[PDB]
Amino acid sequence: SPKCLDWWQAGPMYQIYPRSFRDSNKDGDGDLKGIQDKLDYITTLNIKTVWITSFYKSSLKDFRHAVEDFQEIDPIFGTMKDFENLVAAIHDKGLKLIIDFIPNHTSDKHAWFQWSRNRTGKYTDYYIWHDCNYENGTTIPPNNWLSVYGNSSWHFDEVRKQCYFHQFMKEQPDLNFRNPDVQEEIKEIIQFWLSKGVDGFSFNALQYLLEAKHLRDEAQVNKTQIPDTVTHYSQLHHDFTTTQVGMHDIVRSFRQTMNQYSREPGRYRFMGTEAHGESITETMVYYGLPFIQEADFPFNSYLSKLDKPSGNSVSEVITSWLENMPEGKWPNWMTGGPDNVRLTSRLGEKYVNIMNMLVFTLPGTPITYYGEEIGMRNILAANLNENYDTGTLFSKSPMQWDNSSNAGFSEGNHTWLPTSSDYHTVNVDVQKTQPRSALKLYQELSLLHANELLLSRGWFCYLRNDNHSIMYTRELDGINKVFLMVLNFGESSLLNLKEMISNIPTRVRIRLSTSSAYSGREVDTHAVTLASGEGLILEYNTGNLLHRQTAFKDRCFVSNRACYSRVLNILYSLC
Amino acid sequence: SPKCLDWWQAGPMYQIYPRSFRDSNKDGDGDLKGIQDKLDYITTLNIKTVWITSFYKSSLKDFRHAVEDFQEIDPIFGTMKDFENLVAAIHDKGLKLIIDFIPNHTSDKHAWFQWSRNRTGKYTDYYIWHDCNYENGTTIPPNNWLSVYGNSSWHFDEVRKQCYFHQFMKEQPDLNFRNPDVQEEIKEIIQFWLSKGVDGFSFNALQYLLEAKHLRDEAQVNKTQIPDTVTHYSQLHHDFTTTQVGMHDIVRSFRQTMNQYSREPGRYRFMGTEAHGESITETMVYYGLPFIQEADFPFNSYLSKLDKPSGNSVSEVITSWLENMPEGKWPNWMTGGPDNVRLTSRLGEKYVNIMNMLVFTLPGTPITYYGEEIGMRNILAANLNENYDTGTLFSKSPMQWDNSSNAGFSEGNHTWLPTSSDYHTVNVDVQKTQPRSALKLYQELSLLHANELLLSRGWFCYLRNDNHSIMYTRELDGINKVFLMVLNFGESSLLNLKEMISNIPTRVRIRLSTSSAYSGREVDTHAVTLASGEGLILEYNTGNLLHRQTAFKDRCFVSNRACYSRVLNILYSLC
Ligand SMILES: *[C@@H]1O[C@H](CO)[C@@H](O[C@@H]2O[C@H](CO)[C@@H](O)[C@H](O)[C@H]2NC(C)=O)[C@H](O)[C@H]1NC(C)=O
Ligand SMILES: *[C@@H]1O[C@H](CO)[C@@H](O[C@@H]2O[C@H](CO)[C@@H](O)[C@H](O)[C@H]2NC(C)=O)[C@H](O)[C@H]1NC(C)=O
Ligand SMILES: *[C@@H]1O[C@H](CO)[C@@H](O[C@@H]2O[C@H](CO)[C@@H](O)[C@H](O)[C@H]2NC(C)=O)[C@H](O)[C@H]1NC(C)=O
Ligand SMILES: *[C@@H]1O[C@H](CO)[C@@H](O[C@@H]2O[C@H](CO)[C@@H](O)[C@H](O)[C@H]2NC(C)=O)[C@H](O)[C@H]1NC(C)=O
Ligand SMILES: *[C@@H]1O[C@H](CO)[C@@H](O)[C@H](O)[C@H]1NC(C)=O
Ligand SMILES: *[C@@H]1O[C@H](CO)[C@@H](O)[C@H](O)[C@H]1NC(C)=O
Ligand SMILES: *[C@@H]1O[C@H](CO)[C@@H](O)[C@H](O)[C@H]1NC(C)=O
Ligand SMILES: *[C@@H]1O[C@H](CO)[C@@H](O)[C@H](O)[C@H]1NC(C)=O
Ligand SMILES: *[C@@H]1O[C@H](CO)[C@@H](O)[C@H](O)[C@H]1NC(C)=O
Ligand SMILES: *[C@@H]1O[C@H](CO)[C@@H](O)[C@H](O)[C@H]1NC(C)=O
Ligand SMILES: *[C@@H]1O[C@H](CO)[C@@H](O)[C@H](O)[C@H]1NC(C)=O
Ligand SMILES: *[C@@H]1O[C@H](CO)[C@@H](O)[C@H](O)[C@H]1NC(C)=O
Ligand SMILES: [Ca+2]
Ligand SMILES: [Ca+2]
């Protein structure tokens, strides 16, 4: 008898950017009270977890953040009581809530830093201070290290008369995780939010926690370049400021703090991490070891990087994640996020449905960014008098609920960001009346994913794939039924499935289709037609399963194998 | 009720260089059968653990080693049966046996390497192979990395037509610990020796297990130096070939393999490591974490580095180890070893006794190198027709047992190394007849250390120290007795102890003294005389202990605090 799937394994996650979900008090900024009013809509999506990005008291709301108090709410989002009412409303709905945590830096207005730049007490080495020659407005940094946004990562502080370190903007001084006073502070921040009932954290920017103690220069990517023109982050090799040797042991103490709150059954606290962008073998380290426990999964954002809808492009993201993942770990598929271009603008409107069908039929936890379920798109321009990253700001446009003032988001006259011009046709109210929309298909896949027992605990055998088409099967032993997903990223195709499967009848029934005209229509596997961005979930009966054979041992995947008993009507792991 | 001390915590360790202990078959090389004949002498020293350095089948017996078979014995030392008879003899004596393990490299005659240089099967990537331009006997290495003994660490292999990596000599190709086939091989070597009854391992050269995958050049210590004259290891910064990010996780899997054999009580398997030479904060990482288990202790060889007998020199080694050590860990004190100059030649013959008294009264496990108990010294010259390191060879001279042929070591005409000329006066037989010798005092400290309950579980308060004198106290709460160790590394001293302690009577009795004339003589703490290399263990009665006060909270140390009950007659941890 195998162990039940945890709540973070069983249902999709829904990532919300709280300043753009729903506005309650007519001021143009979303708030925690507005998320509580729309909890009913989240349960129609069969969502399991709500993931709210940062809402702490912040002096900078971008550039990975500048938090002035890790135990407070920013005023625009509400108060501490408004958050406690939201958590009670989320739990009584049967949902879970995970929140963003960034432990790397603070704001230069944090009380810890105003005490540190004065050498007040034990706060003197909460940050990384160093002597640097400064005069006439010019400073000589202790080394050639560059900030992620590009300039010397050392900044002179006139009060302390030294230089402090920052990986990000100068408003974001880096905390010193080599001393144990700072790790006790972060330990107390975790315990404060886990006490309020938060079901887990998403830790971001963990690869920047530690830097080399010797403070030696980095090696330039171009060896023969004049050292005074090195100002771009991509012009250096980052061997001393990223993923130092003691970094994963700090992450493991975060996990051990969260184990104190995850003992009682039903209240396991989730831990997730932002993946290393340029390396997938460094990402799989966060999965932990057979004897050392770490993150529950690192968030896989490699599907949200693709800017060309190709068959070989998607196929490569899938196999590379499942090949490198440790043996019995849980995959996850994130097709969009706050800092990448929305799916409709990146790939095209004809690919919205095919992409919802992909992440819901792959093995693991599908993670959904708000607006992706209705085919939302990037806004073309904005006018913001606040410090934001204009390269990534346009995917945070307010949610489109109906055809009304500000797409039914604010009920005021102004919103912090403009809504898309096509909210008259693309909105939640309109899409849930028409029979086959982007929102309707999402609700059919979310419901299918919930109660199938074949998509949640079934094997995954990835069949061959020419470009422009992806095929794979989900199957469990004692079920006598398999799902066959055919996804066509090409211009068209009329392909023969009897050649490819060799385990398929001549008449199979269509369980679901993105075009949605094939409601329950049967098809003949001799000649199946796929119209350039269409996907089918075929369902039929068979005994000879694909993973039993020796030809497919290499391309079948399962997290924890468990056969099914038609007699006893239970999963059992002995098989 | 606190947990009992393990066998590696309770008694001293005795390090034996097996080729120089005792020769059985007249061939001039010590063997495992010769160690079994002298087990009686090891129990007169009250030794708990025997530590035998490497004896595997080796093509190179120095330069950290070149092993041709990790599951065989070198012929000069005996056979597999001779080892099984030695382990049975060691256990039936009540002793433990730990052995050396080096997992970094092999010999170029290993079967794994003769299969790897031919690309035979899965052995093709057991080692680190790379393409390099070779012609006319000259080779262009893949980067500027240097071997520890100084030259390019890449060597061209004519059969494979590539370059292989070696941190040490070219006869020692480095294993590839990034693939899992090699870590399964080392896992099976550990299980093979733990099955034979070996009670633990000493892992050496663990900081060299991993190297950077990118193979980028190191940074020169002298930035403006011509790159073709960089041939010394000390001319580079070793950021890519030493202590890479995944190294401690490989050590932790070694520990987890040894936990399968350490479950039954009385048979815990010890794990020790060779310390990082130039850094003490990197050494304390091997102690592990509160939640991740690693080495039981890293071997502290900082006492064996001192080449000047100074009071401030010894005092600095002691405080730096106890300050940086994690909270409840076990210290260890190694005053000599196979690769450093013996204690008599490094400091002087007048400092042999004072150094035995130091490591036996400090808190932790004292580790003894064979010959140190009788005041052995380095030989002046040798004539070896084998590849050895002449800089460190002279501390491996054969053990001096009596005034006979070859100091009673071989019973043959030749020995692999000559014995010291002064074996007529310095030998075990002579020293155990005269009343107060180096061997006699060692047996009194070893016996005192065994059954005292104050030196094994007592606090350690390090009192003030002018140069030329070291004072410290060992005390437990419910015992009503304290030991006061006065060690004089200066030229002479007549010091007043009533000024320094303020808890001491005017008449205290001498428990032990290196000069040994003070057998049971009482002394007056008004004027105590110490003759330039003398040490006293003073013993008296008091109630107001030194660690109870607030002035000494900073300079008292204990591994696991536990008071003593005069009524119940047990240690209890609630105090
Ligand atoms: C580093 O910081 C400076 C701070 O001013 C940035 O400034 C640019 O400076 C050049 C001339 O020195 C101007 O032509 C640019 O207009 C400045 N930038 C802006 C946005 O006004 C500089 O860009 C930074 N280096 C980076 C980001 O690589
Ligand atoms: C690395 O940088 C050097 C110098 O910046 C580049 O070499 C050329 O140097 C001359 C100097 O007189 C410049 O006029 C050229 O513009 C430089 N070339 C380029 C492409 O910038 C060298 O090419 C750089 N290496 C690269 C770009 O790989
Ligand atoms: C690197 O390896 C070479 C291999 O020969 C070592 O050789 C020395 O070479 C110089 C001239 O090239 C001779 O004068 C020396 O006598 C050679 N050494 C010996 C021991 O004979 C060289 O020393 C090595 N580099 C080191 C060890 O730093
Ligand atoms: C680093 O190396 C350079 C060059 O090897 C040293 O600079 C001097 O360079 C001239 C070149 O004409 C030599 O004649 C001198 O002998 C070099 N000086 C020395 C001390 O070797 C530079 O000094 C070195 N840096 C050090 C040793 O810190
Ligand atoms: C700055 O320093 C002064 C004196 O050094 C101190 O009185 C003041 O409280 C400090 N400011 C802060 C914000 O700690
Ligand atoms: C003052 O600033 C100028 C900038 O042109 C600089 O060259 C000079 O060294 C500075 N001198 C002092 C004393 O700060
Ligand atoms: C949507 O809103 C517009 C303006 O508010 C209105 O004219 C239109 O009738 C609405 N749509 C429907 C279906 O009622
Ligand atoms: C919003 O602004 C409009 C004019 O811009 C004004 O007529 C209206 O009263 C405002 N609404 C609120 C709630 O203040
Ligand atoms: C060397 O290679 C040949 C053929 O490639 C093979 O027959 C031989 O066994 C190899 N030698 C060793 C020691 O494996
Ligand atoms: C041969 O060796 C000489 C060494 O003087 C070298 O200069 C030359 O490049 C080499 N040529 C070939 C073809 O190996
Ligand atoms: C030690 O050995 C020498 C030579 O074997 C011998 O002359 C001497 O008497 C021995 N010492 C004692 C105390 O017997
Ligand atoms: C040792 O060598 C000597 C001469 O060097 C010889 O007389 C003696 O017999 C040898 N001993 C043995 C055991 O071979
Ligand atoms: Ca940092
Ligand atoms: Ca290695």
Numbering used by the authors:
A (entry chain A), B (entry chain A): 111 to 685
Paper text:
Cystinuria is caused by mutations in system b0,+, which is a Na+-independent cystine/dibasic amino acid exchanger localized at brush border cells in the kidney and intestine. Mutations of the regulatory glycoprotein rBAT and the amino acid transporter b0,+AT, which constitute system b0,+, are linked to type I and non-type I cystinuria respectively and they exhibit distinct phenotypes due to protein trafficking defects or catalytic inactivation. Ca2+ stabilizes the interface between two rBAT molecules, leading to super-dimerization of b0,+AT–rBAT, which in turn facilitates N-glycan maturation and protein trafficking.
To further improve the map quality, we performed the multi-body refinement and focused refinement, improving the map resolution to 2.6 Å for the extracellular domain and 3.0 Å for the individual heterodimer. In rBAT, the Ca2+ ion bridges domains B-I and B-II to reinforce the super-dimer interface. Electrostatic potential calculations of rBAT with or without Ca2+ showed that Ca2+ neutralizes the super-dimer interface to facilitate the homomeric interaction.
